[PDB]
Design an enzyme around this catalytic site. Structure first.
Site, PDB file in Angstrom:
ATOM      1  N   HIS A  99       0.750  -1.980   0.165  1.00  0.00           N
ATOM      2  CA  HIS A  99       0.033  -0.209   0.098  1.00  0.00           C
ATOM      3  C   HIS A  99       1.310   1.508   0.029  1.00  0.00           C
ATOM      4  O   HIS A  99       1.824   0.880   1.286  1.00  0.00           O
ATOM      5  CB  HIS A  99      -1.001   0.005   0.915  1.00  0.00           C
ATOM      6  CG  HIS A  99      -1.816  -0.883   1.065  1.00  0.00           C
ATOM      7  ND1 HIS A  99      -2.652  -0.871   2.181  1.00  0.00           N
ATOM      8  CD2 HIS A  99      -2.435  -2.049   0.204  1.00  0.00           C
ATOM      9  CE1 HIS A  99      -4.355  -1.866   1.701  1.00  0.00           C
ATOM     10  NE2 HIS A  99      -3.830  -2.194   0.247  1.00  0.00           N
ATOM     11  N   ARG A 119      -5.818 -10.976  -4.813  1.00  0.00           N
ATOM     12  CA  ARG A 119      -7.203  -9.728  -4.489  1.00  0.00           C
ATOM     13  C   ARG A 119      -7.565  -9.084  -5.659  1.00  0.00           C
ATOM     14  O   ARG A 119      -7.148  -9.265  -6.759  1.00  0.00           O
ATOM     15  CB  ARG A 119      -7.160  -8.886  -3.673  1.00  0.00           C
ATOM     16  CG  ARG A 119      -7.805  -7.956  -2.898  1.00  0.00           C
ATOM     17  CD  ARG A 119      -8.023  -6.949  -1.893  1.00  0.00           C
ATOM     18  NE  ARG A 119      -7.502  -5.575  -2.985  1.00  0.00           N
ATOM     19  CZ  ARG A 119      -7.784  -4.581  -1.869  1.00  0.00           C
ATOM     20  NH1 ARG A 119      -7.727  -4.508  -1.390  1.00  0.00           N
ATOM     21  NH2 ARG A 119      -7.213  -3.411  -2.584  1.00  0.00           N
ATOM     22  N   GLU A 175     -15.154  -3.405   3.494  1.00  0.00           N
ATOM     23  CA  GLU A 175     -14.880  -2.351   4.017  1.00  0.00           C
ATOM     24  C   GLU A 175     -15.629  -1.501   3.931  1.00  0.00           C
ATOM     25  O   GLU A 175     -15.491  -0.331   4.792  1.00  0.00           O
ATOM     26  CB  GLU A 175     -13.217  -2.101   2.718  1.00  0.00           C
ATOM     27  CG  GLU A 175     -12.399  -0.915   3.358  1.00  0.00           C
ATOM     28  CD  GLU A 175     -11.362  -1.453   2.947  1.00  0.00           C
ATOM     29  OE1 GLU A 175     -10.906  -1.290   1.721  1.00  0.00           O
ATOM     30  OE2 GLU A 175     -10.076  -0.624   4.271  1.00  0.00           O
ATOM     31  N   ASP A 235     -11.494   2.237   4.189  1.00  0.00           N
ATOM     32  CA  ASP A 235     -12.788   2.975   3.838  1.00  0.00           C
ATOM     33  C   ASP A 235     -14.585   3.807   4.784  1.00  0.00           C
ATOM     34  O   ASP A 235     -15.173   4.231   4.996  1.00  0.00           O
ATOM     35  CB  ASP A 235     -13.299   2.073   2.680  1.00  0.00           C
ATOM     36  CG  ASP A 235     -12.514   2.703   1.050  1.00  0.00           C
ATOM     37  OD1 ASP A 235     -11.936   3.494   0.764  1.00  0.00           O
ATOM     38  OD2 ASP A 235     -12.927   1.494   0.894  1.00  0.00           O
ATOM     39  N   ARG A 270      -6.428  -3.114   8.868  1.00  0.00           N
ATOM     40  CA  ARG A 270      -5.425  -2.052   9.645  1.00  0.00           C
ATOM     41  C   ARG A 270      -4.681  -1.235   8.895  1.00  0.00           C
ATOM     42  O   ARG A 270      -3.729  -2.510   8.294  1.00  0.00           O
ATOM     43  CB  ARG A 270      -4.954  -2.706  11.038  1.00  0.00           C
ATOM     44  CG  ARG A 270      -6.466  -3.053  11.878  1.00  0.00           C
ATOM     45  CD  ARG A 270      -5.966  -2.962  13.470  1.00  0.00           C
ATOM     46  NE  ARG A 270      -7.092  -3.511  14.321  1.00  0.00           N
ATOM     47  CZ  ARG A 270      -6.995  -4.790  14.476  1.00  0.00           C
ATOM     48  NH1 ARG A 270      -6.416  -5.556  13.938  1.00  0.00           N
ATOM     49  NH2 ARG A 270      -8.156  -4.658  15.024  1.00  0.00           N
ATOM     50  N   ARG A 327      -9.230   7.688  -2.446  1.00  0.00           N
ATOM     51  CA  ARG A 327      -8.857   6.679  -1.887  1.00  0.00           C
ATOM     52  C   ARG A 327      -8.594   7.171  -0.454  1.00  0.00           C
ATOM     53  O   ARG A 327      -8.171   8.068  -0.328  1.00  0.00           O
ATOM     54  CB  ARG A 327      -7.629   6.237  -2.613  1.00  0.00           C
ATOM     55  CG  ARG A 327      -7.312   6.498  -3.946  1.00  0.00           C
ATOM     56  CD  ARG A 327      -7.865   4.462  -4.673  1.00  0.00           C
ATOM     57  NE  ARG A 327      -7.997   4.923  -5.838  1.00  0.00           N
ATOM     58  CZ  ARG A 327      -7.545   3.480  -6.319  1.00  0.00           C
ATOM     59  NH1 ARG A 327      -7.784   2.252  -5.730  1.00  0.00           N
ATOM     60  NH2 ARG A 327      -7.250   2.862  -8.018  1.00  0.00           N
TER      61      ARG A 327
END
Lengths: 890, 890
Positions: free
Chosen positions: B126, B405, B515, B552, B590, B715
């Site tokens: 990320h 994913r 999410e 989110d 997290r 985002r």
């Protein structure tokens, strides 16, 4: 604190073999303590009586126990020395300060002399390393644990985990068979030797150079030691010395050369990625900019997925990364090529894709350094890039340059085959004059000598094939060709001719080995006669190296006469070289034991005649001494420190030259010493008989240390070994008694002149002090026990005669040094092993205790033993342990 | 001591750019000090006035200086924490003691629960790691120097060499371009992630397990943690998560899988030779004897020269060496095969010659352990062999299991293509019922679905090809298939069917990702409906994992409402799983920042509802947090320590369950909080306008951190980033003000009930305490400056409204926690950068300062900048530095 090791080890011993055996070990320890205290010779028999009761397995376990206790004592000793030295918050900084204050020498003189100074340490596989490598590792782990324990920053759990760790590592050491059941191959010796590189030396050399930089800055020299300055170098004999060792074949030399090359390539490759990560600057000169642009032109826009990091084409934003990227590519292909060349017989990797030059490698790194300095980044350049530069310019493409050694008679056999096949005579029968004229005519001639159809022996083909192997391999992989038993110029010229004739593209330098006293006496004459040959002096290019052996000199003559003749030899060899304008560098074949010219390194260097080194020194490191001086970071540093400091001081602080009265006095003294020595070691006809019985000499070959398959005709290594095991040290002190007694007898003022010599002449001071050290490690009661247990009732007084001379000689030694901190205790363990070694020898030389699947106990570890089941292992264990306690094998 | 870094760095800064710039930096430091002291908002403008004068290059150098000073502050902070903790001579031993004393739990209960406990840390790429890897290394070296300095065992020369070293390493850090000039590839992200293995984790896992062994022995449990007990595991998203990232292609997943496999093979190979050297025992069982005899039968009497050590056939005298020798052979061929498979597209290395099983590897090592234990060598076995066993059973043949994913809509597009091509309808238009019935009929049917001739889009072929890549690769290389935006059972069953249909031999488990707040509200119902499908519950084998996103949730609704709904979600998901007899393990997505569910790890674990972990936990480590928790040995240990302790305590010490009054109270409180949040972030029509001006949000993409190319539609990462840069923290505290005020308004005893809740309910205590921490890192004067400099005169009061709520909310927070050690100083540097960031933004959003070879100065580093020459670099530098000072990016 000495009780600590005893506590921990004996706890493990009880956890492995019960209370009973731990109590018997304790009894032996107490008897040995009463012996090293009260010195009652009855205590020895009192101890042996306890030793006789032991079962076959139990005696093995006892020898094991005292051996490992001695090893642990050595390790604790090393830790205590390293810490006791570290808590001070000769020596490099001290040597510099003394050179400035005492001798008025300036910093730039020290820096200049240090730039032009070289120390070539050459490691040998001489069979003096008693402890097997499988156990040497465990010792390394144990000394790591003990070093981390000897500190005051222990956090309770760390201390407990180190307790469990040291416990399990001792248990692992004790659970390995300490006995080599087969002797090693030469390749195994070369691996054992090179292991100290990818463990200590590889990182130790850059650190040491950084420390020298720090010292130079503490004298005011902002400048740094040049990366390419050759302050230290490494050579090897492992896989090259074939003198008397037929197992060192040409294929062995090829194997060890390719091996070393592959190891070097691997180490550079592991370094190069981390160096690439650090060199992340974007400023460079126009020079490095242009070069990086060149590499980015032929950048090969490809995936390059075989690498882990930097698999994408490196951008010109980071130019150092571009250049070091090309260095990485050539490193990868160098490693892969050497890996295939070794694995198979050949490789498809193009030679142009690898590093072929010693400094094709250096050029891009040099460029990076110039760039960093020009752009103001000299601090960055003097970091990992400097470490890497120094490693390259110190280890090159093959970690060590290999020496080849061979006896002269083998070259003579070859040439004789050549002259007989050519129907021109027999080179053997030819006089020296004829050999010189012929060899010269062939060296200067242009027609080939022998052909494919030359009739060869297995020996002749051995030497010819080693020359072809030398020709096939890279030149920078080899060092020198050492001629054993070299006596005439024809011996050197024979090697020059055989090299040229075997199409050795870049022939390696030839160097004679004078080791026997007769050859040392006549060495300067022979070197002068060689330099007289105008062809050789013109091809030698003003530089000559000659080896000076120390092992055999003190074997046929007295130790004193040997040392003194060695001094004379160095002195007159320098005289000859200066007379011919040749820079002579002398190669000292020193041992670890004083009997083979060993002793503290700085003392041995100080005992060299002045103006004989001149910033060029070459010294052997006999097998076991390798472990002694490179098994830890601190040991390695103290080693390079000791050598370079001693050489620099011996260059700028010349030792005093002997007064002529001291010259004649030592000549007479040497005559008396030699007569006294040969009187007891050669004139006595029963001497060899008494020796083969009173010492464990004959059993030495049972340890299987090396790969090499009258008393005048034995090797010096087991010669010193025998008299050090018994702790008598005959070859160290023999001639000194009669020498000194005759010198004070002829004149009483010669006592005042001996007192004068001990306080002013470094050679004499070192000699006497060494003899005093060796006496401090001696105990004649041991030799008395060996005589009483193993020598026939007849020549019992013979040994006593020797025992007389011992004390007599000792009385003289302290009388010249003017002498009359409490370590001891270890001699207790040693004493036990002494007793165990004696009685076991008695049981070995018997008829009743002779011989006429898996293993689950120690007794089954030797099923092919000609002696009784449990005996041979016990004897070998005793030798190992006693050698460990005395910190010397041979 | 804080002055030390300032001294050294400013010395280097003067040595690199002169006195003038060092003095201007000092002026800025003094103004910032007067601001963080007196808090006069005039001082900010006083500082900006000094900032305006700066030349284009000089402002770059100033941002550079304060950025590196913040980094050094972080490193000194880490050193001071590690030492301050070490000089004590939650926590593991403390947790054990409390579990015994407080809760009466017995040691065997702790040991049993600990054996059956698992913690799966999954590293993600990320884009939250602001510092480039090229600089992260230099930081590592610098913290090494500072760690070695912060000690009292410095020997003067060592200290001086560390001075030169730290000086050159700072100079090297400052001499690298901190700006990523191109965004990374996913493979680059996977390398950055895996670098922590062959640097810290690889040796850190065995050490941590040894420490757990020590603690267990401090409770009286002589037994050791089973080597195969899975206390910690590692998964990865790097190269697997393709959700919204089209650059993560199937070839990328193949690349990162083969890569990881080759890295693992290399590490095992480097270990195996040293392990072979240690296992030098000769005692074994009849079992290991028989096996070693088997290996010695097919021993291949060959040269085997490709190895360095042990190239000769290993004798049966050392059986452990025989077996470990075979392990070495299969390791060599495993590494070479993976190396060819990666380098080329194929390998000739036979699969039978490598390790194909996760425990074909383990079997011989297990045998060695059984042997050592049976023969009394359990101490030896619990050493390097245990370290190696734990590394194998923890990392396997591919260091990390990779997750894939993908968003549900992509699977729906695929299935729609399949039903349209089959002329049976349009899967998109189908209702849920129809999708379930059809998918079930195909999953239970035996006829193939699509064929070679199925019309595919680049997207459809993307997902189909990722399934084929999954099928082609080993099963133990992958983890879970996570479905983004999962809403119905048809979304899971679609993936099960597409897997089975793409001939995925061992299909990986499917896991939904909830999410968004709407999906979290309806998650338990959806999971229950999925478990109702008997086919899926029979194939799920009683174990189900479901992911719970945190990013989110707090973006569209209030942070408080998000946290509370998350708690409810976990609780009712456990209810459903228990209702279906399925062992549920929940995957917590997290972040590092509290805005994305970050915060201290043990606090986040404590704020989970009770009986929701049950010895099975799975947590993401968002990019930057990787560096935060594994960049040093100590950091890695404190990480694994924190996680395993928190899980064990949450298992045996369940947190209190909320009283029903607290349930209803938090429901009302959540309603008020959500209305208060959406009132200002969505109802205000000018809110997005004010946001795109008052925060540096839009510029985030300029840092080039990741490989991924209205406010509801952005985002969450740059959302939290914007409000943390300005140090306002709106998304952290927004709803709390109106929530608390309404709760005390409706009833006055609700103040006593809030006081009651803060002192007894762990979830509420953690929530409030976190909000208090975030307030401690906030300063509304900064947001005031940004408004005054960048927001139009019109909606100036809007921000002030927010500024009101801020303080108001803060007043309430301390009122619930009952509050009213002197680090500060770093906020000075941050403040300077804040000012520098504000004014620079003003100069960026202008027309005059817009745009209408090698590099030898910073200004030439950006030649393709649409903005003024020196501006863009300055802005990026400000963002980096402020993020570093706040120790969080997004």
């Amino acid at each position: 604190y000495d009780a600590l090791l005893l506590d921990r080890f004996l706890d493990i011993l009880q956890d492995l073999h019960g209370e009973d055996l731990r109590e018997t070990v304790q009894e032996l320890y107490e008897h040995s303590a009463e012996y090293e205290g009260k010195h009652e010779p009855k205590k020895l028999e009192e101890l042996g009586s306890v030793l006789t009761s032991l079962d076959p397995g139990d005696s093995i376990v006892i020898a094991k126990a005292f051996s490992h206790m001695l090893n642990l004592a050595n390790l604790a000793e090393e830790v205590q020395i390293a810490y006791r030295r570290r808590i001070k918050k000769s020596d490099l900084e001290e040597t510099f300060k003394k050179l400035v204050g005492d001798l008025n020498k300036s910093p730039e003189e020290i820096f200049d002399a240090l730039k032009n100074q070289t120390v070539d340490l050459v490691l040998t596989a001489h069979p003096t390393q008693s402890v097997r490598r499988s156990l040497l590792q465990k010792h390394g782990r144990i000394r790591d644990c003990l070093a981390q324990l000897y500190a005051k920053d222990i956090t309770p759990d760390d201390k407990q985990e180190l307790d469990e760790a040291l416990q399990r590592e001792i248990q692992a050491a004790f659970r390995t068979d300490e006995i080599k059941r087969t002797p090693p191959t030469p390749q195994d010796e070369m691996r054992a030797g090179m292991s100290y590189f990818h463990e200590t030396i590889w990182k130790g050399v850059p650190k040491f150079l950084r420390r020298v930089d720090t010292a130079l800055k503490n004298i005011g020299i902002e400048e740094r030691v040049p990366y390419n300055a050759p302050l230290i170098q490494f050579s090897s004999w492992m896989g090259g010395d074939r003198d008397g060792n037929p197992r060192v074949t040409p294929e062995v030399t090829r194997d060890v050369c390719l091996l070393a090359r592959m190891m070097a390539a691997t180490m550079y490759f592991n370094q190069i990625e981390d160096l690439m990560f650090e060199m992340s600057m974007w400023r460079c000169n126009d020079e490095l900019r242009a070069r990086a642009d060149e590499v980015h032109a032929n950048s090969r826009k490809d995936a390059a997925k075989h690498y882990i990091e930097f698999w994408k084409s490196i951008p010109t934003t980071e130019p150092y990364r571009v250049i070091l990227g090309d260095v990485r590519d050539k490193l990868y292909h160098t490693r892969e090529r050497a890996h295939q060349l070794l694995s198979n017989g050949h490789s498809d990797v193009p030679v142009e894709a690898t590093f072929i030059n010693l400094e094709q490698f250096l050029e891009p790194l040099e460029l990076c350094y110039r760039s960093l300095c020009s752009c103001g980044d000299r601090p960055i350049a003097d970091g990992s890039l400097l470490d890497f530069l120094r490693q390259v310019s110190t280890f090159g493409l093959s970690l060590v340059r290999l020496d080849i050694r061979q006896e002269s008679d083998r070259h003579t056999d070859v040439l004789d085959a050549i002259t007989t096949h050519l129907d021109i005579g027999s080179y053997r029968e030819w006089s020296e004059e004829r050999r010189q004229e012929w060899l010269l005519s062939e060296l200067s001639g242009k027609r080939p000598l022998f052909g494919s159809d030359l009739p060869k022996t297995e020996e002749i083909a051995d030497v010819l094939d080693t020359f072809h192997v030398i020709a096939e391999l890279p030149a920078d992989s080899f060092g020198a060709y050492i001629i054993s038993m070299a006596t005439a110029p024809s011996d050197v010229l024979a090697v020059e001719l055989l090299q040229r004739e075997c199409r050795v593209k870049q022939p390696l330098r030839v160097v004679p080995l004078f080791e026997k006293l007769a050859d040392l006496e006549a060495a300067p004459a022979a070197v002068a006669r060689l330099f007289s040959v105008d062809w050789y002096k013109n091809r030698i290019n003003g530089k000559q190296e000659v080896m000076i052996g120390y092992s055999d000199s003190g074997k046929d003559a007295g130790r004193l006469s040997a040392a003194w003749q060695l001094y004379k030899a160095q002195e007159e060899l320098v005289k000859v070289a200066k007379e011919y304008g040749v820079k002579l560098t002398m190669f000292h074949g020193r041992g670890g034991t004083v009997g083979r010219g060993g002793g503290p390194t700085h003392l041995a260097i100080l005992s060299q005649p002045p103006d004989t080194i001149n910033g060029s020194l070459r010294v052997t490191v006999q097998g076991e001494v390798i472990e002694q001086s490179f098994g830890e970071e601190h040991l390695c540093f103290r080693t390079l420190q000791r050598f370079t400091a001693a050489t620099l001081e011996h260059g700028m602080r010349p030792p005093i030259s002997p007064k002529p009265e001291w010259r004649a006095l030592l000549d007479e003294m040497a005559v008396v010493a030699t007569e006294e020595y040969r009187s007891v070691v050669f004139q006595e006809p029963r001497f060899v008989e008494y020796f083969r019985l009173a010492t464990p000499e004959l059993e030495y070959g049972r340890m299987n240390i090396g790969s090499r398959p009258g008393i005048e005709s034995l090797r010096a290594i087991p010669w010193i070994f025998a008299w050090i095991q018994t702790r008598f040290h005959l070859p160290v002190w023999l001639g000194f008694g009669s020498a000194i007694r005759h010198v004070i007898e002829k004149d009483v003022r010669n006592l005042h002149m001996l007192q004068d010599m001990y306080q002013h002449w470094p050679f004499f001071r070192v000699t006497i002090d060494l003899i005093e050290m060796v006496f401090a490690k001696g105990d004649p009661g041991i030799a008395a026990l060996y005589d009483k247990l193993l020598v026939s009732e007849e020549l019992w007084p013979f040994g006593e005669k020797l025992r007389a001379n011992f004390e007599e000689t000792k009385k003289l030694i302290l009388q010249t040094a003017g002498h009359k901190q409490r370590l001891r205790l270890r001699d207790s363990y040693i004493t036990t092993l002494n007793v165990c070694q004696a009685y076991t020898l008695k049981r070995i030389r018997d008829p009743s205790y002779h011989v006429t699947k898996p293993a689950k106990e120690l007794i089954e570890l030797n099923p092919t033993s000609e002696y009784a089941p449990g005996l041979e292992d016990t004897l070998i264990l005793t030798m190992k342990g006693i050698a460990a306690g005395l910190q010397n094998t041979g």
